[PDB]
Amino acid sequence: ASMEVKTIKVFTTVDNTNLHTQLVDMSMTYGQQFGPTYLDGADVTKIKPHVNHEGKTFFVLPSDDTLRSEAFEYYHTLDESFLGRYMSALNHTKKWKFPQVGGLTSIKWADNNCYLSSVLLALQQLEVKFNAPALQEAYYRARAGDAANFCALILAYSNKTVGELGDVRETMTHLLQHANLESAKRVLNVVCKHCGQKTTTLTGVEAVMYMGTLSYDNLKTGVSIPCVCGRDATQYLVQQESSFVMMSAPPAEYKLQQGTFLCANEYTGNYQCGHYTHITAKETLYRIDGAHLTKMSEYKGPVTDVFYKETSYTTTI
Numbered sequence: 001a002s003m004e005v006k007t008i009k010v011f012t013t014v015d016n017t018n019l020h021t022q023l024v025d026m027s028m029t030y031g032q033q034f035g036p037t038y039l040d041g042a043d044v045t046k047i048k049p050h051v052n053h054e055g056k057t058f059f060v061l062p063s064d065d066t067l068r069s070e071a072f073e074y075y076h077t078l079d080e081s082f083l084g085r086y087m088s089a090l091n092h093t094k095k096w097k098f099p100q101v102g103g104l105t106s107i108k109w110a111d112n113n114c115y116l117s118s119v120l121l122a123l124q125q126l127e128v129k130f131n132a133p134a135l136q137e138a139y140y141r142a143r144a145g146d147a148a149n150f151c152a153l154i155l156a157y158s159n160k161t162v163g164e165l166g167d168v169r170e171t172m173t174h175l176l177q178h179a180n181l182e183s184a185k186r187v188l189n190v191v192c193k194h195c196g197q198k199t200t201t202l203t204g205v206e207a208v209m210y211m212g213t214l215s216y217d218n219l220k221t222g223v224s225i226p227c228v229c230g231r232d233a234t235q236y237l238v239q240q241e242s243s244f245v246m247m248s249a250p251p252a253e254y255k256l257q258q259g260t261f262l263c264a265n266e267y268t269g270n271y272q273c274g275h276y277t278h279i280t281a282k283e284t285l286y287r288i289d290g291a292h293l294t295k296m297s298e299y300k301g302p303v304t305d306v307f308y309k310e311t312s313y314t315t316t317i
């Protein structure tokens with residue numbers, strides 16, 4: 001338009017909470033004035049300002065102490081490439097569909113996001129709290145059906161990109177590290193027939209996840225494990241302090257009886273290239289597969305993860 005000095009008022013941010021007013025020179029690009037810049041996850045580093053941009057909020061990278069501090073307080077990470085991978089992933093997740101299925105927010109399949117849909121579904125049924133404000137907020141919105149952000153954060157925290165199939169268990173591990181499980185505790189009694197006995201105590205994420213069996217009952221009765229030497233020593237739960245536990249194991253035909261578990265995940269296909277679907281229950285058993293739901297009276301299939309509700313448990317040994 002009118003050839004003259006033109007500068008518009010926009011806002012820059014790293015957490016979308018603290019907004020920094022900026023007067024930009026329309027005669028140059030965002031990159032030249034802010035460095036890598038984003039608008040709704042879309043990279044606009046190489047373009048110049050538009051009047052349509054007045055009053056809009058742009059994401060930039062932590063280029064100064066204030067920004068570094070703000071980004072850290074919000075996301076709780078020091079990974080320099082975090083903000084970038086997040087915007088990059090959000091640029092895609094914002095196009096996904098998040099239908100309500102069985103009363104839970106699910107995700108229409110796209111880009112092998114079935115493992116993310118399983119994670120999201122599981123979370124909504126667990127008493128779990130995040131410490132990173134970034135996740136508290138995005139999670140709150142996902143429960144209402146607007147999970148584009150929450151999905152992008154999960155991808156960024158577990159350092160995966162849109163398109164690649166991930167492992168639910170492993171993804172929960174990365175994710176739960178930013179949850180409040182500071183009071184989660186597990187005490188295991190190990191007994192090697194030969195070399196006596198000891199007691200192992202796990203806390204945080206390690207206190208709620210187990211790999212080997214899908215049965216929480218077995219963990220309580222005893223499960224074998226390779227000893228320093230000799231055979232496989234026995235091990236069993238003595239104390240459990242958490243709002244839930246997750247029992248994992250390689251997919252295998254398993255029967256799931258309603259009332260005996262919280263929710264679970266089945267996986268069909270080959271290692272790293274199969275398909276996940278979520279199993280839960282309300283009035284009956286529900287099989288949630290993205291935007292698909294199937295109600296059944298009984299279930300038996302390839303299960304890898306089973307969640308159980310917990311408060312506090314102690315042995316009768």
Ligand SMILES: Cc1ccc(N)cc1C(=O)N[C@H](C)c1cccc2ccccc12
Pocket residue numbers: 165166167168249250251267269270271272273274304
């Ligand atoms: C989807 C995915 C992405 C990344 C990585 N690293 C792993 C997986 C993955 O295949 N996980 C499933 C549940 C799995 C785990 C353990 C043993 C399994 C044996 C046979 C078939 C599946 C098996």
Ligand SMILES: [Cl-]
Pocket residue numbers: 128129130135136137139140
């Ligand atoms: Cl939360």
Ligand SMILES: [Cl-]
Pocket residue numbers: 259260261262307308309
């Ligand atoms: Cl349960």
Ligand SMILES: [Zn+2]
Pocket residue numbers: 192194195227228229230231
């Ligand atoms: Zn031994």
